[PDB]
Design a protein around this motif. Structure first.
Motif, PDB file in Angstrom:
ATOM      1  N   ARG A   1      -0.555   3.055 -17.917  1.00  0.00           N
ATOM      2  CA  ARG A   1      -0.127   2.028 -16.979  1.00  0.00           C
ATOM      3  C   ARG A   1       0.964   2.585 -16.077  1.00  0.00           C
ATOM      4  O   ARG A   1       1.836   3.327 -16.535  1.00  0.00           O
ATOM      5  CB  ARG A   1       0.373   0.799 -17.748  1.00  0.00           C
ATOM      6  CG  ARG A   1       1.100  -0.241 -16.935  1.00  0.00           C
ATOM      7  CD  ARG A   1       1.783  -1.226 -17.867  1.00  0.00           C
ATOM      8  NE  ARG A   1       0.830  -2.122 -18.510  1.00  0.00           N
ATOM      9  CZ  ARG A   1       0.650  -2.211 -19.821  1.00  0.00           C
ATOM     10  NH1 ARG A   1       1.345  -1.470 -20.666  1.00  0.00           N
ATOM     11  NH2 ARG A   1      -0.252  -3.065 -20.296  1.00  0.00           N
TER      12      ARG A   1
ATOM     13  N   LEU B   1       3.909   1.564 -13.216  1.00  0.00           N
ATOM     14  CA  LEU B   1       4.744   0.482 -12.699  1.00  0.00           C
ATOM     15  C   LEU B   1       5.833   1.067 -11.814  1.00  0.00           C
ATOM     16  O   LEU B   1       6.641   1.874 -12.281  1.00  0.00           O
ATOM     17  CB  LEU B   1       5.364  -0.321 -13.845  1.00  0.00           C
ATOM     18  CG  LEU B   1       4.409  -1.011 -14.820  1.00  0.00           C
ATOM     19  CD1 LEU B   1       5.187  -1.795 -15.856  1.00  0.00           C
ATOM     20  CD2 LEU B   1       3.441  -1.918 -14.080  1.00  0.00           C
ATOM     21  N   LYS B   2       5.866   0.652 -10.545  1.00  0.00           N
ATOM     22  CA  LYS B   2       6.889   1.134  -9.623  1.00  0.00           C
ATOM     23  C   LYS B   2       8.282   0.732 -10.095  1.00  0.00           C
ATOM     24  O   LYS B   2       8.491  -0.381 -10.580  1.00  0.00           O
ATOM     25  CB  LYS B   2       6.654   0.593  -8.211  1.00  0.00           C
ATOM     26  CG  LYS B   2       5.681   1.394  -7.362  1.00  0.00           C
ATOM     27  CD  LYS B   2       4.237   1.106  -7.692  1.00  0.00           C
ATOM     28  CE  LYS B   2       3.838  -0.269  -7.188  1.00  0.00           C
ATOM     29  NZ  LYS B   2       2.399  -0.558  -7.431  1.00  0.00           N
ATOM     30  N   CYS B   3       9.241   1.648  -9.950  1.00  0.00           N
ATOM     31  CA  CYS B   3      10.603   1.413 -10.424  1.00  0.00           C
ATOM     32  C   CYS B   3      11.641   1.923  -9.427  1.00  0.00           C
ATOM     33  O   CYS B   3      12.655   2.513  -9.813  1.00  0.00           O
ATOM     34  CB  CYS B   3      10.823   2.051 -11.794  1.00  0.00           C
ATOM     35  SG  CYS B   3      10.675   3.850 -11.835  1.00  0.00           S
TER      36      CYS B   3
ATOM     37  N   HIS C   1     -12.169  13.523   5.311  1.00  0.00           N
ATOM     38  CA  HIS C   1     -13.100  12.454   4.950  1.00  0.00           C
ATOM     39  C   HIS C   1     -13.649  12.620   3.540  1.00  0.00           C
ATOM     40  O   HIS C   1     -14.157  13.684   3.176  1.00  0.00           O
ATOM     41  CB  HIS C   1     -14.265  12.417   5.941  1.00  0.00           C
ATOM     42  CG  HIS C   1     -13.882  11.993   7.323  1.00  0.00           C
ATOM     43  ND1 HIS C   1     -14.772  11.999   8.374  1.00  0.00           N
ATOM     44  CD2 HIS C   1     -12.710  11.544   7.827  1.00  0.00           C
ATOM     45  CE1 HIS C   1     -14.163  11.581   9.468  1.00  0.00           C
ATOM     46  NE2 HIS C   1     -12.912  11.295   9.163  1.00  0.00           N
TER      47      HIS C   1
ATOM     48  N   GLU D   1       3.280   4.801 -19.011  1.00  0.00           N
ATOM     49  CA  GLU D   1       3.322   4.583 -20.447  1.00  0.00           C
ATOM     50  C   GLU D   1       1.928   4.253 -20.954  1.00  0.00           C
ATOM     51  O   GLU D   1       1.075   3.761 -20.214  1.00  0.00           O
ATOM     52  CB  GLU D   1       4.290   3.459 -20.827  1.00  0.00           C
ATOM     53  CG  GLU D   1       3.881   2.092 -20.328  1.00  0.00           C
ATOM     54  CD  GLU D   1       4.896   1.026 -20.674  1.00  0.00           C
ATOM     55  OE1 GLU D   1       5.929   1.369 -21.283  1.00  0.00           O
ATOM     56  OE2 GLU D   1       4.660  -0.155 -20.343  1.00  0.00           O
TER      57      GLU D   1
ATOM     58  N   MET E   1      -9.287  16.855   9.473  1.00  0.00           N
ATOM     59  CA  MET E   1      -9.923  15.723   8.810  1.00  0.00           C
ATOM     60  C   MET E   1      -9.956  15.881   7.298  1.00  0.00           C
ATOM     61  O   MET E   1      -9.789  16.976   6.766  1.00  0.00           O
ATOM     62  CB  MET E   1     -11.336  15.515   9.345  1.00  0.00           C
ATOM     63  CG  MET E   1     -11.382  15.081  10.792  1.00  0.00           C
ATOM     64  SD  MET E   1     -13.056  14.787  11.369  1.00  0.00           S
ATOM     65  CE  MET E   1     -13.638  16.468  11.522  1.00  0.00           C
TER      66      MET E   1
ATOM     67  N   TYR F   1       7.022   4.288 -13.585  1.00  0.00           N
ATOM     68  CA  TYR F   1       6.902   4.560 -15.009  1.00  0.00           C
ATOM     69  C   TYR F   1       5.442   4.764 -15.383  1.00  0.00           C
ATOM     70  O   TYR F   1       4.543   4.142 -14.814  1.00  0.00           O
ATOM     71  CB  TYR F   1       7.475   3.425 -15.861  1.00  0.00           C
ATOM     72  CG  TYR F   1       8.976   3.288 -15.836  1.00  0.00           C
ATOM     73  CD1 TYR F   1       9.786   4.205 -16.486  1.00  0.00           C
ATOM     74  CD2 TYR F   1       9.582   2.219 -15.197  1.00  0.00           C
ATOM     75  CE1 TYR F   1      11.158   4.076 -16.477  1.00  0.00           C
ATOM     76  CE2 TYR F   1      10.952   2.081 -15.186  1.00  0.00           C
ATOM     77  CZ  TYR F   1      11.735   3.012 -15.825  1.00  0.00           C
ATOM     78  OH  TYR F   1      13.103   2.872 -15.811  1.00  0.00           O
TER      79      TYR F   1
END
Ligand SMILES: [Mg+2]
Ligand SMILES: [Mg+2]
Ligand SMILES: [Mg+2]
Ligand SMILES: [Mg+2]
Ligand SMILES: [Mg+2]
Ligand SMILES: [Mg+2]
Ligand SMILES: [Mg+2]
Ligand SMILES: [Mg+2]
Ligand SMILES: [Mg+2]
Ligand SMILES: [Mg+2]
Ligand SMILES: [Mg+2]
Ligand SMILES: [Mg+2]
Ligand SMILES: [Mg+2]
Ligand SMILES: [Mg+2]
Ligand SMILES: [Mg+2]
Ligand SMILES: [Mg+2]
Ligand SMILES: [Mg+2]
Ligand SMILES: [Mg+2]
Ligand SMILES: [Mg+2]
Ligand SMILES: [Mg+2]
Ligand SMILES: [Mg+2]
Ligand SMILES: [Mg+2]
Ligand SMILES: [Mg+2]
Ligand SMILES: [Mg+2]
Ligand SMILES: [Mg+2]
Ligand SMILES: [Mg+2]
Ligand SMILES: [Mg+2]
Ligand SMILES: [Mg+2]
Ligand SMILES: [Mg+2]
Ligand SMILES: [Mg+2]
Ligand SMILES: [Mg+2]
Ligand SMILES: [Mg+2]
Ligand SMILES: [Mg+2]
Ligand SMILES: [Mg+2]
Ligand SMILES: [Mg+2]
Ligand SMILES: [Mg+2]
Ligand SMILES: [Mg+2]
Ligand SMILES: [Mg+2]
Ligand SMILES: [Mg+2]
Ligand SMILES: [Mg+2]
Ligand SMILES: [Mg+2]
Ligand SMILES: [Mg+2]
Ligand SMILES: [Mg+2]
Ligand SMILES: [Mg+2]
Ligand SMILES: [Mg+2]
Ligand SMILES: [Mg+2]
Ligand SMILES: [Mg+2]
Ligand SMILES: [Mg+2]
Ligand SMILES: [Mg+2]
Ligand SMILES: [Mg+2]
Ligand SMILES: [Mg+2]
Ligand SMILES: [Mg+2]
Ligand SMILES: [Mg+2]
Ligand SMILES: [Mg+2]
Ligand SMILES: [Mg+2]
Ligand SMILES: [Mg+2]
Ligand SMILES: [Mg+2]
Ligand SMILES: [Mg+2]
Ligand SMILES: [Mg+2]
Ligand SMILES: [Mg+2]
Ligand SMILES: [Mg+2]
Ligand SMILES: [Mg+2]
Ligand SMILES: [Mg+2]
Ligand SMILES: [Mg+2]
Ligand SMILES: [Mg+2]
Ligand SMILES: [Mg+2]
Ligand SMILES: [Mg+2]
Ligand SMILES: [Mg+2]
Ligand SMILES: [Mg+2]
Ligand SMILES: [Mg+2]
Ligand SMILES: [Mg+2]
Ligand SMILES: [Mg+2]
Ligand SMILES: [Mg+2]
Ligand SMILES: [Mg+2]
Ligand SMILES: [Mg+2]
Ligand SMILES: [Mg+2]
Ligand SMILES: [Mg+2]
Ligand SMILES: [Mg+2]
Ligand SMILES: [Mg+2]
Ligand SMILES: [Mg+2]
Ligand SMILES: [Mg+2]
Ligand SMILES: [Mg+2]
Ligand SMILES: [Mg+2]
Ligand SMILES: [Mg+2]
Ligand SMILES: [Mg+2]
Ligand SMILES: [Mg+2]
Ligand SMILES: [Mg+2]
Ligand SMILES: [Mg+2]
Ligand SMILES: [Mg+2]
Ligand SMILES: [Mg+2]
Ligand SMILES: [Mg+2]
Ligand SMILES: [Mg+2]
Ligand SMILES: [Mg+2]
Ligand SMILES: [Mg+2]
Ligand SMILES: [Mg+2]
Ligand SMILES: [Mg+2]
Ligand SMILES: [Mg+2]
Ligand SMILES: [Mg+2]
Ligand SMILES: [Mg+2]
Ligand SMILES: [Mg+2]
Ligand SMILES: [Mg+2]
Ligand SMILES: [Mg+2]
Ligand SMILES: [Mg+2]
Ligand SMILES: [Mg+2]
Ligand SMILES: [Mg+2]
Ligand SMILES: [Mg+2]
Ligand SMILES: [Mg+2]
Ligand SMILES: [Mg+2]
Ligand SMILES: [Mg+2]
Ligand SMILES: [Mg+2]
Ligand SMILES: [Mg+2]
Ligand SMILES: [Mg+2]
Ligand SMILES: [Mg+2]
Ligand SMILES: [Mg+2]
Ligand SMILES: [Mg+2]
Ligand SMILES: [Mg+2]
Ligand SMILES: [Mg+2]
Ligand SMILES: [Mg+2]
Ligand SMILES: [Mg+2]
Ligand SMILES: [Mg+2]
Ligand SMILES: [Mg+2]
Ligand SMILES: [Mg+2]
Ligand SMILES: [Mg+2]
Ligand SMILES: [Mg+2]
Ligand SMILES: [Mg+2]
Ligand SMILES: [Mg+2]
Ligand SMILES: [Mg+2]
Ligand SMILES: [Mg+2]
Ligand SMILES: [Mg+2]
Ligand SMILES: [Mg+2]
Ligand SMILES: [Mg+2]
Ligand SMILES: [Mg+2]
Ligand SMILES: [Mg+2]
Ligand SMILES: [Mg+2]
Ligand SMILES: [Mg+2]
Ligand SMILES: [Mg+2]
Ligand SMILES: [Mg+2]
Ligand SMILES: [Mg+2]
Ligand SMILES: [Mg+2]
Ligand SMILES: [Mg+2]
Ligand SMILES: [Mg+2]
Ligand SMILES: [Mg+2]
Ligand SMILES: [Mg+2]
Ligand SMILES: [Mg+2]
Ligand SMILES: [Mg+2]
Ligand SMILES: [Mg+2]
Ligand SMILES: [Mg+2]
Ligand SMILES: [Mg+2]
Ligand SMILES: [Mg+2]
Ligand SMILES: [Mg+2]
Ligand SMILES: [Mg+2]
Ligand SMILES: [Mg+2]
Lengths: 120, 122, 55, 114, 211
Positions: A96, A98-100, A3, A114, A1, A112
């Motif tokens: 920030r 951001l999927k790339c 939790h 930045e 587990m 990314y």
RNA sequence: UGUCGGCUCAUCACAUCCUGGGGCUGAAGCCGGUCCCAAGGGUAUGGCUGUUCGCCAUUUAAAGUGGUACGCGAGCUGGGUUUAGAACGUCGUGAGACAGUUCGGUCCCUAUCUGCCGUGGACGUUUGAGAUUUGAGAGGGGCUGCUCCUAGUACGAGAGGACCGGAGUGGACGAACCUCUGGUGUUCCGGUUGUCACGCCAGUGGCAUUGCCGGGUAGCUAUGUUCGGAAAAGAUAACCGCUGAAAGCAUCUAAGCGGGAAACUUGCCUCAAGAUGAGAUCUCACUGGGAACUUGAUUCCCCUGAAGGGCCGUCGAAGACUACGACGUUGAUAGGCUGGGUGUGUAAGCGUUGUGAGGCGUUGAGCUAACCAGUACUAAUUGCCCGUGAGGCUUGACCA
RNA sequence: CUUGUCGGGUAAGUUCCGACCUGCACGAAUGGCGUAACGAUGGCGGCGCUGUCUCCACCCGAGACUCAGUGAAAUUGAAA
RNA sequence: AGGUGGUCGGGUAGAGAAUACCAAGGCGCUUGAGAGAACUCGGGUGAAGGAACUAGGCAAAAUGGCACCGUAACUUCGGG
RNA sequence: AACCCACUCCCGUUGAAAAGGUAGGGGAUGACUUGUGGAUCGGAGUGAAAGGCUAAUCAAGCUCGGAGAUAGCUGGUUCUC
RNA sequence: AGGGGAGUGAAAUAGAACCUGAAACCGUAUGCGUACAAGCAGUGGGAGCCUACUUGUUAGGUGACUGCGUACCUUUUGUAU
């Protein structure tokens, strides 16, 4: 587990993890934009954002505390002089994610990371 | 909590220095004896001219335990060692003096004699 | 442990009835008209109507 | 947990003068043998302290009759009638569990004069 | 039983009595319950009352559910529960608060127990392990034997094996109500209650009770 | 077709060890003996020995007898036994032998099918959808000691000592939980040894099992806390009857009417309409054309795709992957930020004292994971795909 | 025969130590009886120590699990 | 992850060519990314007991250096 | 310590390995260990002796011949009426 | 790498791994059957659907439902074994 537990093991010893995220934080403050794995990016924001908040006020004890967590003179110089002054009025969320996509070698999800107000 | 082959000292002047638990009485498959529980012991070490002898099987009551005893408000009282009081056939103390403190839960019907003999009740 | 009998053509094809692949969620960036993965940065370098990396 | 904190806040009215681990305190406990109501004194050195609001607790150790005894008190329990600090000690730690392996002159706590 | 409230488990605390006794207590917030539908012998077969509590967004309520919550002017809450009542009269719109309970009043509490993912036989069925030394070979927490030889020569149905200590519903019976807080909408119950903090619990008068 | 014993896990029978109900007694009472009914639940720890067994010690209400390849090595072990070495006694001229002792001696296999424990995908349930449900059926559970009152009463010369009925507190077993008592807590704070580095001093960091240690938040957890086994009803077993003839009497039986147990059916908890016999209730959505027929539960084309579901994302006391649960800007879902709390234990720098280690002040300081409350700063897009267009026929009754 | 009998050690000792002699079937260079030191040698008993155990709990790494790439094996009369 | 003769072999601690952290020099061991179930492997800590485990203290835990004090039966007079 | 060995546990047993590895273990100036070259061999050699070793083979090595040894023993033996 | 055309050739589905190119084995397309059903998978009966055409006493493909039905060889007194 598991939790209510926080943190990812990432298939490394706890000494490996400390060194690796300490390396990413130094790279991010210098290059202002890096590309890494998505799970790694979500753990970096719990390490590098406390450092920016710590640098919002300049003192000898604070610059010593920052150096103990990033053993880099350039990284401590970049803070306390550029960051912390740029983010003086910003209440959190200094970076920030951001999927790339995915890498070709192993189909690993990437993102990314930045800083929010890059001068570019 | 006391189980078989636990070693505990004697809070009396009956002549025994160490006794070893060989049975926890009062129930099938019972595991532990606390403060106020009857056990079966064997004398492991004794005074040259006491009133008990080495290798003698007899009955004792646990008076003082390392694990401790809990009260109704959540508090707990603990001691630094496990101690017992040897009893005779009719469940009465064999010695005439009692050394060290005892606890208020020993004030039952059949152990009131050894509460009154103790230098302190906690 | 190993089989006492070899599997039939039908038996091993029913096991593979769960091996199909699913499709991804794709979107069209209206500013450029480019197809990209949903919630991802386009191969050009756009996301939600902004330039992020510019190659 | 916001409304549990309010349940517990209504039961915390005792004063509980400030004390620290290593201090020598006297606790007045309530004993109700029969119908009579008396007070018993438990004097010793505070070795541990648990600061959890209404669930606060502290442990005191004393040598009774050649036997060491430790009692953990619930601070806000009505059994603890009152508390007083007889002496203050000078220690570096929060929990003095090393005192259990010391017996006589070795288990003396230095006093905090100032 | 046959009537109760739906609450949320807030956590655990203690209360001290004037005599110096600590009572372990579980705090249950009971947001007032609104009657949504009443079921009778003729209309539905059996006889029960339907209840909702809490709040939900307008965007998370479907049109089928919104029209059901509009026949009884109740406004949408989280979840919907039913209580099979013996012989009581209710109308669509009545409120049900902590006021049907008093101090004393042995009650039963139902909830969803904490979920262990996939448990072995030692944790799930309280098996005992083999040796940790004396020559044992990679068989320390394994179950052991699961049947017999040629005769029957299969595993019997109901054999105790490993997997999913569940997040199931369990009831705890004959718990004592210690305090009923009418203005704060709280029930204080002596003992433990299944589930984690923030889960849904159902409180009913004790079925067995008696003594 | 791997042969003893041990461990782990069991399942059944009743020729019943305990608890339950009775008849007789050479049954005063308290205890017993024997027989009948009863399989619901229970049914020791050790010293010796390879032992099953047995004998001892100390318990218990009791330490049942048997079947299952003398249950169980593709679940473990390898002490015994039955390879190869060596020795003793005895037998043989000898090589050697002994169902006689003694010391030592390699236990392989990634689970296809049936089976079992969990968890999903598809289709169906006759238009589709959101939610709440009934219960045919099936599992779980069912143990018991001691003390007190009745009452020193019935019984008994006395010693002793009850039935029936009520109250309390234990042992073993099970479930849930983390308020308390503790354990852990390589993600928090300190002490310290050796060495290398940050230019150097100071201060820090890497490595040495987390270097070694002292504490410790959340979570998990027992040894900690709370709860449970019932009462009650029905139909019965042995047994005890009422009335009553055949057979003017007698007789529980032939007609008829009762009492009666942890066994059976409920009552308590959980699952449960794939119960294809696919059940019930509340609410919601869809109210367009044309052509071809092999002329009706038909096919094709254009338009129109709703209620809702999914993909995706931010996550979760939910989790192997799933599934389940909350949220997606009209937002507190996660991270940060701001306060607090908790833990550790008086940071750095500076100022004083001292030749110096060190002390003293600023100072309960500084730091602080998972906790509590608030806050759109960052990330949850402005999307795509499934799902349609009023729901066949026959018969009967209401209706127009 | 045999767990011979007696004594010691344990609460309890088919093993151990000391004796007895009724040596099934010891015995004097296939040596007899002792023996300090020595032994990864056999048997027994104690102190310390402990997760060996009552009775397991939590934590850390490598697998197991999922995704991408490569890609075996024993076995197999046919199988609804 | 096996075997293979000989030579050189620095600093700080250290008796040392042991051991630890480094120098010169060399390398991160030719599948990765996740997640954090049972179970297996290699480890850390453990309340109260302390060999009750087992064929058997198997395994683990424990002891461990230098100086000084002190040290029994027995002995082949070295020893122990 | 190096070096030579191989007493215990565990892992591994389709192994990283047709005999290993991590932890512990014994000898370690000698009846020691080791490099190069040489000598003894198939009813023969060598053996501080285990029937051990003589190229992953030993109660009589490997290879080629006698040789298609012999097999009262298992197995198999093919189109139609 | 491999293909799509174009060209040579009588013929490239004779294209160099090149005459012919079978079986095991692996695919794509069409027709019918298959998600309340128990077993050597066939055989006897048999509806429905599809195709072709001689338009139903026909041919071809499927086989809902149902009676019966425990492989082959060897060795044996005897084998589903
Ligand atoms: Mg969290
Ligand atoms: Mg380290
Ligand atoms: Mg098979
Ligand atoms: Mg076979
Ligand atoms: Mg199948
Ligand atoms: Mg597959
Ligand atoms: Mg649970
Ligand atoms: Mg869970
Ligand atoms: Mg066990
Ligand atoms: Mg083994
Ligand atoms: Mg093995
Ligand atoms: Mg193991
Ligand atoms: Mg088997
Ligand atoms: Mg069968
Ligand atoms: Mg079972
Ligand atoms: Mg077999
Ligand atoms: Mg068992
Ligand atoms: Mg049967
Ligand atoms: Mg019977
Ligand atoms: Mg009989
Ligand atoms: Mg019986
Ligand atoms: Mg009986
Ligand atoms: Mg009787
Ligand atoms: Mg029975
Ligand atoms: Mg039984
Ligand atoms: Mg039964
Ligand atoms: Mg039965
Ligand atoms: Mg019953
Ligand atoms: Mg036993
Ligand atoms: Mg026994
Ligand atoms: Mg033995
Ligand atoms: Mg049995
Ligand atoms: Mg039989
Ligand atoms: Mg038999
Ligand atoms: Mg057997
Ligand atoms: Mg048996
Ligand atoms: Mg085995
Ligand atoms: Mg076996
Ligand atoms: Mg095995
Ligand atoms: Mg098998
Ligand atoms: Mg196995
Ligand atoms: Mg053996
Ligand atoms: Mg052995
Ligand atoms: Mg031999
Ligand atoms: Mg002879
Ligand atoms: Mg050996
Ligand atoms: Mg042997
Ligand atoms: Mg099969
Ligand atoms: Mg039913
Ligand atoms: Mg069924
Ligand atoms: Mg039932
Ligand atoms: Mg049952
Ligand atoms: Mg009962
Ligand atoms: Mg029992
Ligand atoms: Mg329990
Ligand atoms: Mg539990
Ligand atoms: Mg706790
Ligand atoms: Mg806590
Ligand atoms: Mg330097
Ligand atoms: Mg320095
Ligand atoms: Mg350092
Ligand atoms: Mg370094
Ligand atoms: Mg350490
Ligand atoms: Mg150490
Ligand atoms: Mg510590
Ligand atoms: Mg620590
Ligand atoms: Mg701790
Ligand atoms: Mg904790
Ligand atoms: Mg009569
Ligand atoms: Mg009559
Ligand atoms: Mg009559
Ligand atoms: Mg009759
Ligand atoms: Mg249905
Ligand atoms: Mg339905
Ligand atoms: Mg819609
Ligand atoms: Mg939904
Ligand atoms: Mg998840
Ligand atoms: Mg969801
Ligand atoms: Mg708001
Ligand atoms: Mg928050
Ligand atoms: Mg904060
Ligand atoms: Mg604090
Ligand atoms: Mg200071
Ligand atoms: Mg300071
Ligand atoms: Mg510091
Ligand atoms: Mg001060
Ligand atoms: Mg502080
Ligand atoms: Mg003998
Ligand atoms: Mg003898
Ligand atoms: Mg004897
Ligand atoms: Mg023994
Ligand atoms: Mg002679
Ligand atoms: Mg001789
Ligand atoms: Mg001799
Ligand atoms: Mg030697
Ligand atoms: Mg010896
Ligand atoms: Mg012993
Ligand atoms: Mg793969
Ligand atoms: Mg060196
Ligand atoms: Mg040294
Ligand atoms: Mg070295
Ligand atoms: Mg270098
Ligand atoms: Mg990974
Ligand atoms: Mg792990
Ligand atoms: Mg382990
Ligand atoms: Mg350890
Ligand atoms: Mg710790
Ligand atoms: Mg312990
Ligand atoms: Mg500790
Ligand atoms: Mg301890
Ligand atoms: Mg000890
Ligand atoms: Mg033993
Ligand atoms: Mg035993
Ligand atoms: Mg050992
Ligand atoms: Mg060790
Ligand atoms: Mg000696
Ligand atoms: Mg060498
Ligand atoms: Mg080891
Ligand atoms: Mg080694
Ligand atoms: Mg060595
Ligand atoms: Mg030597
Ligand atoms: Mg030489
Ligand atoms: Mg030669
Ligand atoms: Mg030869
Ligand atoms: Mg031989
Ligand atoms: Mg050769
Ligand atoms: Mg060889
Ligand atoms: Mg010839
Ligand atoms: Mg031949
Ligand atoms: Mg044959
Ligand atoms: Mg041409
Ligand atoms: Mg051709
Ligand atoms: Mg051709
Ligand atoms: Mg070809
Ligand atoms: Mg030709
Ligand atoms: Mg060709
Ligand atoms: Mg072909
Ligand atoms: Mg196919
Ligand atoms: Mg097809
Ligand atoms: Mg059916
Ligand atoms: Mg069908
Ligand atoms: Mg079938
Ligand atoms: Mg036919
Ligand atoms: Mg036909
Ligand atoms: Mg047919
Ligand atoms: Mg047929
Ligand atoms: Mg048939
Ligand atoms: Mg035969
Ligand atoms: Mg035969
Ligand atoms: Mg056959
Ligand atoms: Mg036949
Ligand atoms: Mg066969």
């Amino acid at each position: 587990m598991r939790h209510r537990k926080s943190g990812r093991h990432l298939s490394r010893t706890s000494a490996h993890r400390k060194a690796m995220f300490q390396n990413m934080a130094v790279s991010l403050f210098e290059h202002e934009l890096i590309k890494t794995t998505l799970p790694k990016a979500k753990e970096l924001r719990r390490v590098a954002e406390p450092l920016i908040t710590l640098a919002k006020e300049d003192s000898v004890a604070n610059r010593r505390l920052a150096f103990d967590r990033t053993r880099s003179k350039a990284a401590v110089g970049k803070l306390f002089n550029d960051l912390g002054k740029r983010y003086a009025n910003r209440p959190g969320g200094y970076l920030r994610i951001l999927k790339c996509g995915f890498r070709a070698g192993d189909n690993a999800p990437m993102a990314y990371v930045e800083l929010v107000d890059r001068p570019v | 909590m006391i189980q078989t082959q636990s070693m505990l000292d004697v809070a009396d002047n009956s002549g025994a220095r160490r006794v070893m638990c060989i049975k926890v009485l009062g129930g099938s498959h019972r595991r532990y004896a606390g403060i106020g529980d009857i056990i079966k012991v064997t004398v492991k070490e004794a005074i040259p001219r006491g009133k008990v002898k080495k290798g003698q099987v007899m009955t004792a009551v646990v008076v003082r335990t390392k694990h401790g005893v809990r009260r109704t408000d959540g508090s707990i009282i603990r001691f630094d060692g496990n101690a017992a009081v040897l009893l005779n056939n009719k469940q009465e103390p064999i010695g005439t003096r009692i050394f060290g403190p005892v606890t208020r839960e020993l004030r039952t019907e059949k152990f009131m004699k050894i509460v009154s003999l103790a230098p302190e009740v906690l | 442990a190993v089989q006492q009998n070899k599997k039939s053509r039908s038996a091993r094809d029913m096991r593979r009835s769960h091996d199909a692949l699913e499709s991804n969620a794709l979107s069209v960036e209206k500013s450029t008209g480019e197809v990209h993965l949903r919630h991802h940065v386009s191969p050009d370098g756009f996301y939600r109507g902004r330039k992020v990396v510019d190659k | 947990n916001k409304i549990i904190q309010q349940i517990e806040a209504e039961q915390m009215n005792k004063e509980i003068p400030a004390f620290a681990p290593g201090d020598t305190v006297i606790v007045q406990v309530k004993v109700k043998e029969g119908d009579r109501q008396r007070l018993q004194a438990f004097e010793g050195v505070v070795i541990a302290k648990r600061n959890r609001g209404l669930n606060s607790a502290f442990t005191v150790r004393k040598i009774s009759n050649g036997v060491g005894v430790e009692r953990t008190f619930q601070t806000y329990s009505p059994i603890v009638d009152s508390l007083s600090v007889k002496r203050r000690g000078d220690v570096r730690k929060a929990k003095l569990y090393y005192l259990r392996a010391l017996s006589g002159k070795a288990a003396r706590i230095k006093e905090k004069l100032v | 039983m046959t009537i109760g409230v739906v609450g949320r488990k807030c956590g655990m605390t203690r209360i001290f009595t004037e005599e110096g006794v600590s009572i372990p207590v579980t705090v249950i917030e009971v947001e007032p319950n609104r009657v949504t539908q009443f079921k009778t012998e003729e209309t539905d077969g059996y006889r029960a009352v339907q209840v909702t509590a809490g709040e939900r967004r307008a965007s998370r309520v479907t049109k089928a559910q919104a029209g059901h919550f509009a026949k009884a002017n109740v406004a949408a809450g989280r979840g919907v529960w039913e209580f099979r009542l013996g012989e009581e009269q209710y109308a669509a719109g009545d409120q049900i608060t902590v006021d049907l309970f008093q101090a004393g009043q042995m009650v039963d509490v139902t909830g969803e127990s904490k979920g262990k993912g996939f448990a072995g036989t030692i944790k799930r069925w309280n098996f005992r392990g083999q040796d940790n030394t004396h020559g044992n070979s990679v068989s320390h927490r394994v179950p052991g034997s699961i049947g017999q030889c040629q005769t029957p020569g299969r595993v019997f149905k109901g054999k105790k094996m490993s997997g999913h200590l569940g997040a199931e519903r369990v009831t705890v019976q004959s718990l004592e109500i210690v305090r009923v807080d009418a203005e704060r909408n709280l029930l204080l119950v002596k003992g433990a209650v299944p589930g984690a903090t923030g889960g849904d619990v159902i409180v009913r008068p004790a079925a067995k009770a008696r003594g």
